[PDB]
């Protein structure tokens, strides 16, 4: 299937850093027009992740794969994250999607 | 709060690979269940024989890769000797192994291959001979766990 | 095991004092040759903590334990502190380590 | 080991096809500018093999490997073959080499 | 009082390091600042650019044996692009031509080696100055063995 | 990949390993540089702009036995400038590798001698620098970074 | 004079007409000394605090060393305003004669070079000096055989 | 919203051409008396762009929209460009403004 997200379900803890990778399968899609979307758990609007600061995006052109490392993890960054890419060959323009869910757990629980 | 009255022996060494040595094979002796005593010294990642005699040489390395994207990769492992009588690198023990015989993970990946290589033999060594265990691709080393890569000599 | 750091994750405020305990499990390692190393958060320049002043070291030979009291905590005293010991039985002599993270929040 | 020519010593008979493979290990070298040099046995010339016809060159950027298939082998095609690649990062520009020799025997030509 | 500068390092051999080459930075007339870290006897380049790498070693022995010792000294580089130790600078020196003194013993010999050059380094590259025989080191007096890099 | 641009005239050339009895300088090899205007013409570096440069060179000599009488090993970096079109020595060194011991019924033994030169100089546009040795038949370029030659604009 | 150029700089070469002494000169062709560097008593005086590159080479020549007990030294030292004692920054020793002394033959000219270089943080008023223990074996015959210099990085 | 600059954040390369469009929303402002002002990055004084050479203007009174094409772009011409128009109906005469910033990156100089 066009575009294969590798990290399906992740459960990292508050204060960490997760990278989600996507691999392109259609030789018409380009790693140049890549986009990322987050959907905060409990709401429906899918927001567009802005690449800067906590959201850094890497690319590997040989295998046509791109990834998105998120640092300084908080507990409000739990949601369904998708990657996207724009494909265009002749008289055709379309886009492709994937899927991968995040759960970030917090701390405390000092068992006394 | 205990007591110890244990004896000693003859030139011996059993060194283990460095786990925190990024993509490299650094030999260590100051780690649990490792030996370097009775005169065997480790200079430049090489063991220096302290006395002439009959020795047993052995070494194992574990190779791991996270995919086979090349049907033309060669893994080799050799214990060589540069001697005081003949100051040239000569192979005492050698082995070759081809880790990837298939037609590369062209679809899905995450196929870690593990290929170990073991060497052993008895030799006559002289004082000052420098033994060295080496591999051709130090990027495939699996030193993540303990006792996966090692190298040692023992005076018989 | 091989030395056990007890306070794994601690979070204290500027101006306080944290104690880190390490317990020997190998009866060949001695509470006499103990060493301490600090790594400031987000930097791989693991340095050797010196025994004196703000850094006081307590040894108890009976329970095979040593600890490291750190006083006057600042906002720059946040990192990862590891303990060490020198072991020696017969023809073998080696050392052992631990692991445990410190984070200090400033007021 | 900065590009690795794999078939070091190969021995084929007149009328064949030998494949010589090289894989890049330097992450600065590119599979786009590749050159091949053959040195005919007994002379030191290392003339440049051309890409076309009897010399077909296959390039694959995914595994970063290139090969040089030689078909209709004669006995005049016996020599030491090298592969080459052009590397470039910052202010540095260099090229890389390999090695591998071929020996071709004839077919004895059975006379009726 | 005067502002710092750029990635710099000048590390010196350890005098109380029995028969081994451990590089030190917290000793008089030594530098290690502006991002350069000394990990496991290795210098880590913190930023991409052109650097000048140099090192000197002084070898001293108390006599010429028959083994015929070969003294080597090389500064090698492990890069993120090519994960193999490759030599940047190297030198070899044979100290003993003597036919092993059989009556005029001792007689201390001294042999130095100096290496220096300009190279382009990348972020995270690890430079290492090493020698094959760390048992002939003369770290007795100050600044006889050293190793350093400077961002030009 | 790409991180920082970098600049100023620099050159670090290394001897050709597939050369016999000759010190041929190469630039298109792994850890060698020749950029920001410095030209390599007739085994010579051509300074592209005036300024203060750092000049260095190393040479490794090896022979497998001690020869007869005294052999002298030389290593010099010279400069021919547009201002004064005569080659003058900037750096020089001489070294005696074989101290008597002319083998007469005794075993041969390989000797090694390195020589290093370095200094700061003011060069002008079009100056032609060359590092050379007197006996290019004792060169040991069998290993990497044993013989090299370079300049950098400070 | 056309283009300015700057930084404290010095590249001084030994005086050929001194014989048994190492006198540093700047007024001789390809030699430099400008932008504040002072040469007092064969000593270079730092004009400003900062990072410097220090280097020096010496060439020794003797006519068939008859004495096994020969020791050649070359060191660059620093006397600073903060700590008023001479300490060596860079040092090297070389044994020119490995006992092998001419017995029934003629002289044997030996040449031994020594090179030193390193980067240091220097302060204002610091006195650098390159010195040798055998100034009678100095070979300043040719041109770039003996020198000493610094450049402000 | 009484004059609308379309390209708010632009990133062009030295040697390119950016077009900024402004559309009138007040039917009292005229597409004939339009003015442009730029503020160079890091400076506070706002300078007035002149009509000639590098600055070509397209005006269409039918749609009440005017544009300013900027050619031969350098790296020192990065700043906030605003458009303006003169409005007049009865006893009232006023002006209207917009906003839009340009950032130019350089292209280095291949040093062999």
């Amino acid at each position: 299937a066009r575009v294969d997200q590798t990290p399906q379900t992740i459960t990292k803890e508050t204060g960490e850093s997760l990278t989600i990778n996507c691999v392109l399968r259609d030789s018409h899609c380009a790693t140049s027009s890549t986009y990322w979307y987050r959907k905060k758990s409990g709401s429906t609007n899918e927001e567009s992740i802005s690449k800067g600061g906590r959201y850094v995006e890497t690319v590997n052109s040989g295998s046509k794969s791109f990834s998105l490392r998120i640092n300084d993890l908080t507990v409000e960054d739990s949601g369904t994250y998708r990657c996207a890419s724009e494909c265009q060959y002749g008289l055709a323009e379309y886009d492709v999607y994937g899927g991968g869910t995040v759960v970030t757990v917090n701390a405390a629980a000092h068992h006394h | 709060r205990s007591s110890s009255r244990t004896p000693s022996d003859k030139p011996v060494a059993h060194v283990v690979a460095n786990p925190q040595a990024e993509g490299q094979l650094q030999w260590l002796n100051r780690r649990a269940n490792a030996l370097l005593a009775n005169g065997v010294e480790l200079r430049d990642n090489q063991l220096v024989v302290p006395s002439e005699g009959l020795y047993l040489i052995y070494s194992q390395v574990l190779f791991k890769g996270q995919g086979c994207p090349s049907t033309h990769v060669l893994l080799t492992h050799t214990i060589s000797r540069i001697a005081v009588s003949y100051q040239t690198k000569v192979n005492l023990l050698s082995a070759i192994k081809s880790p990837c015989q298939r037609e590369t993970p062209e679809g899905a990946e995450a196929k870690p291959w593990y290929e170990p290589i073991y060497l052993g033999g008895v030799f006559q060594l002289e004082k000052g001979d420098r033994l060295s265990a080496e591999i051709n691709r130090p990027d495939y080393l699996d030193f993540a766990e303990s006792g996966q890569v090692y190298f040692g000599i023992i005076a018989l």
Side-chain angles (χ1 to χ4, degrees), chain A, chain B:
Chain A
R2 304 176 183 92
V3 150
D4 277 352
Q5 300 219 356
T6 37
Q8 310 109 359
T9 55
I10 45 169
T11 340
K12 292 205 81 176
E13 199 174 349
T14 42
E16 290 174 6
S17 59
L18 62 97
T19 338
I20 293 185
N21 295 41
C22 290
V23 171
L24 281 54
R25 314 292 276 221
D26 197 334
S27 183
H28 296 327
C29 311
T31 41
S32 56
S33 318
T34 56
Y35 301 103
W36 289 91
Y37 295 145
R38 174 254 315 286
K39 187 186 186 184
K40 70 189 298 180
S41 293
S43 177
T44 62
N45 171 279
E46 279 194 354
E47 311 179 79
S48 61
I49 292 172
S50 307
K51 59 104 201 168
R54 292 187 55 255
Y55 303 123
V56 288
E57 182 179 12
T58 96
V59 285
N60 179 222
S61 308
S63 59
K64 288 277 189 176
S65 58
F66 56 117
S67 74
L68 180 74
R69 179 167 260 256
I70 299 175
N71 310 311
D72 302 349
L73 268 46
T74 170
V75 81
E76 304 187 308
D77 285 39
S78 303
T80 38
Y81 294 56
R82 291 193 317 176
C83 57
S85 178
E86 287 191 11
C87 325
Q88 169 246 296
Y89 184 28
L91 302 177
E93 172 170 69
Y94 53 106
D95 48 3
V96 270
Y97 294 86
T101 285
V102 181
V103 181
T104 189
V105 306
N106 44 38
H110 324 94
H111 324 81
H112 268 294
Chain B
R1 203 56 47 169
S2 44
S3 55
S4 170
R5 288 108 77 177
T6 170
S8 41
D9 295 294
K10 50 200 175 173
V12 52
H14 175 76
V15 303
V16 48
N18 189 352
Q20 49 174 53
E22 173 187 343
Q24 288 295 313
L25 183 67
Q26 184 192 341
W27 295 118
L28 295 182
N29 57 87
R30 294 191 51 89
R31 277 180 151 69
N33 292 294
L35 294 88
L36 182 72
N38 288 144
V40 182
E41 302 177 359
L42 197 157
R43 289 192 178 116
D44 53 339
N45 265 265
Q46 281 183 4
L47 290 182
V48 175
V49 183
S51 68
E52 176 171 2
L54 284 170
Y55 288 83
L56 175 68
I57 307 170
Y58 60 112
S59 169
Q60 177 175 43
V61 305
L62 188 56
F63 291 111
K64 174 202 172 186
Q66 280 287 0
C68 283
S70 66
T71 326
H72 282 292
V73 52
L74 284 187
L75 275 42
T76 86
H77 177 209
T78 165
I79 301 180
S80 57
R81 168 187 177 205
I82 190 177
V84 282
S85 61
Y86 173 56
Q87 298 270 350
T88 309
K89 190 182 287 291
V90 296
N91 295 349
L92 302 185
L93 313 165
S94 175
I96 311 166
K97 200 168 194 172
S98 58
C100 291
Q101 193 191 33
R102 76 176 317 292
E103 58 269 4
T104 80
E106 199 63 43
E109 271 82 13
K111 285 97 170 180
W113 53 267
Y114 297 76
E115 295 287 19
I117 293 182
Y118 186 80
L119 291 175
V122 177
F123 297 90
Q124 180 181 286
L125 310 173
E126 315 154 11
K127 190 170 179 183
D129 293 359
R130 304 172 290 117
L131 300 166
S132 55
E134 48 195 2
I135 53 170
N136 70 313
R137 295 201 56 167
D139 52 15
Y140 286 151
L141 265 186
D142 187 1
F143 39 65
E145 301 291 68
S146 302
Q148 299 191 294
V149 182
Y150 51 83
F151 165 53
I153 68 171
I154 170 64
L156 311 172

